Design brief:
There is one protein chain. This protein has 385 residues and is α+β, with helices and mostly antiparallel strands. It has two domains: 1-59 and 149-212 and 326-378, 3-Layer(bba) Sandwich (FAD/NAD(P)-binding domain); 60-145 and 213-321, 2-Layer Sandwich (D-Amino Acid Oxidase, Chain A, domain 2). It is built from nine helices and 22 strands. It has helices spanning 13-24, 62-78, 99-110, 121-126, 149-162, 205-208, 232-235, 288-301, 350-363; strands spanning 4-9, 29-32, 49-51, 84-85, 89-94, 116-119, 136-141, 145-147, 166-168, 173-179, 182-187, 190-199, 214-215, 219-228, 243-248, 251-256, 264-268, 273-274, 309-319, 326-330, 333-340, 383-384. The structure holds flavin-adenine dinucleotide and chloride ion. Chloride ion binds at residues 43, 317-318, 342-344, 346. It is found in: Cytoplasm. FAD binds at residues 5-35.
Length: 385
C-alpha cells in the first residue's frame, strides 16, 4: 500500500548518504537494508576511515574528495555524533619506486593542495615512532584526516529519518522488476514500488546485480585490521601522530593514530582473501596472515606500536578490474542508479557520492564529472545477460 518517490536498496555507506540527500529535499524515500546500519557485516565498520585529498589512486578524484570533505564538515555541525578528526595523512614510499606516492605528489601539485614534502630522517625526526630507510620520501597532507564511519552512517540515518525517510531493516531484497516508468523490489517482508531506484548493496552487488541483467566483474575480498597496544607518547592522536597510507616493497598499508588510548590501527591494503559475502569468515585471526602481515610492517616501520593485539575486525572490499568506482545510471533503465565496486577506497567519498546519487535519481544527471566511474567504460568489462 505504500509507493515511494525513491527506493534505496542497501542503506550503507553510499545508500544512507543518498537517503539523507533525498530526504533533505522532501523526496519520499524508502531505504531497505539486509541488516541494521551501521553494522559489522558490510564494508563500513572498524570505527575509522581515512580521507585524503591529494589522491594517489588518481588525481581525477580530487574534486569529489574536496566536496566530500566539505560535506563532512557540514555533517559535523548538524549532529552530536563525532564525525571527523584532522589528524592529517602521511604518505611515503621508496624514492622513485612508488606510483602511489608519485601520483599523490602530482595530484597535490595539480590542484594546489597544501602539503609538506620530506624524506629520509626528516620523516623519523618529525614523527618519533616512524622508522623508515633513508631512501624513502614522503608527502604529508595536514588538512586530511580521519572519519568515524559508523557515526557518519548513524548520523545520516537519524537526520534522514527525522525528515521522513523510512528505513526497513533486516530485509534482504531478492529481486527487482523494472519498467519504463516505475521500479519494484521484492523482499521476504513484502514488495515496494517507486519512481526511481538506487542500488548500493556493497559486497552483495557482486551477487545480485545479475537480477538487473547486469554482468560486471566484481570481486569481494576479506580485509582485516588490527588495533595494537602502542607507545602513547608517540602514536596518539593527542601528540599528532598522523593517519597514513604507505607503499613498501611488499604492498600498501594504511593506519590510524591511537585515539583515546585504544591503540594504533593497521591494515594491509593490497592483499586479501577472495570470498563470497555470504560465506566469508568474519573472525579475525583464523588465518595466520591476519596478524602476521600486520606485525611484519609494524616491527619494521612503527616498532613502538607492535604491542599486544587489543582488537581485530574483518571487513570487505569489492573490486572492479580498474579499481575505480561504478556510479552511473543503469544502461537499460534511466530510472535505476548503480553504486558499486568502491574497491576498498570509497568511504571518504560517501558524502559526495550521496549527493551524486540523489541528483542522478532525481534528474538523471549530476553536476559532478563522473565519467571516470561510467558503467560503460571498457576497462570495466561490463555487459548485459
Ligand atoms: C573494509 C575496509 C574498507 C575500507 C577501509 C578499511 C577496511 C578494513 N578503510 C577505508 C579508508 O580508510 N578510507 C576510505 O575511503 N575507504 C576505506 N574503506 C572502503 C570503504 O569502507 C568502502 O568502499 C565503503 O564502505 C563502500 O560502501 P558501500 O555502501 O558500497 O558498502 P556498505 O557500506 O557495506 O553498504 C552496503 C549495504 O547494503 C546492504 N545490502 C546488501 N545486500 C542487500 C540486499 N540484498 N538487500 C538489502 N540490503 C542489502 C548491506 O547490509 C550493507 O549495509
Ligand atoms: Cl569497497
Amino acid at each position: 500500500s505504500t509507493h515511494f518517490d525513491v527506493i534505496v536498496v542497501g542503506a550503507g555507506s553510499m545508500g544512507m548518504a543518498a537517503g539523507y540527500q533525498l530526504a533533505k529535499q522532501g523526496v519520499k524515500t524508502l531505504l531497505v537494508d539486509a541488516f541494521d546500519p551501521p553494522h559489522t557485516n558490510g564494508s563500513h565498520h572498524g570505527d575509522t576511515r581515512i580521507i585524503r585529498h591529494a589522491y594517489g589512486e588518481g588525481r581525477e578524484y580530487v574534486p569529489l574528495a574536496l566536496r566530500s570533505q566539505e560535506l563532512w564538515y557540514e555533517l559535523e555541525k548538524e549532529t552530536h555524533h563525532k564525525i571527523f578528526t584532522k589528524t592529517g595523512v602521511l604518505v611515503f614510499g621508496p624514492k622513485g619506486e612508488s606510483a602511489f606516492v608519485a601520483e599523490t605528489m602530482e595530484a597535490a601539485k595539480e590542484h594546489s593542495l597544501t602539503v609538506d614534502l620530506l624524506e629520509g630522517d626528516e620523516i623519523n625526526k618529525r614523527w618519533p615512532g616512524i622508522t623508515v630507510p633513508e631512501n624513502y620520501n614522503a608527502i604529508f597532507e595536514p588538512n586530511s584526516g580521519v572519519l568515524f564511519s559508523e557515526n557518519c552512517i548513524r548520523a545520516y540515518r537519524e537526520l534522514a529519518e527525522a525528515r521522513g525517510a523510512k528505513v526497513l531493516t533486516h530485509t534482504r531484497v531478492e529481486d527487482f522488476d523494472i519498467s519504463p516508468d516505475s521500479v519494484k523490489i521484492e523482499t521476504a517482508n513484502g514488495s515496494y514500488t517507486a519512481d526511481k531506484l538506487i542500488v548500493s548493496m556493497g559486497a552483495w552487488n557482486s551477487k545480485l546485480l545479475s537480477k538487473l541483467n547486469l554482468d560486471i566483474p566484481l570481486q569481494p575480498y576479506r580485509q582485516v585490521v588490527g588495533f595494537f597496544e602502542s607507545d602513547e607518547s608517540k602514536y596518539s592522536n593527542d601528540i599528532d601522530f598522523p593517519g597514513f597510507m604507505v607503499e613498501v616493497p611488499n604492498g600498501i598499508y594504511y593506519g590510524f593514530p591511537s585515539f583515546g588510548g585504544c591503540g594504533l590501527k593497521l591494515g594491509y591494503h593490497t592483499f586479501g582473501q577472495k570470498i563470497d559475502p555470504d560465506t566469508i569468515n568474519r573472525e579475525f585471526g583464523v588465518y595466520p596472515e591476519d596478524e602476521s602481515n600486520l606485525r611484519a610492517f609494524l616491527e619494521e616501520y612503527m616498532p613502538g606500536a607492535n604491542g599486544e593485539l587489543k582488537r581485530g575486525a574483518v571487513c570487505m572490499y569489492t573490486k572492479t578490474l580498474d579499481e575505480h568506482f561504478i556510479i552511473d545510471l543503469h544502461p537499460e533503465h534511466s530510472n535505476v542508479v548503480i553504486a558499486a565496486g568502491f574497491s576498498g577506497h570509497g568511504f571518504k567519498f560517501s558524502s559526495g557520492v550521496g549527493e551524486v546519487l540523489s541528483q542522478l535519481a532525481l534528474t538523471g544527471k549530476t553536476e559532478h564529472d563522473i565519467s571516470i566511474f561510467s558503467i560503460n567504460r571498457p576497462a570495466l568489462k561490463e555487459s548485459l545477460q
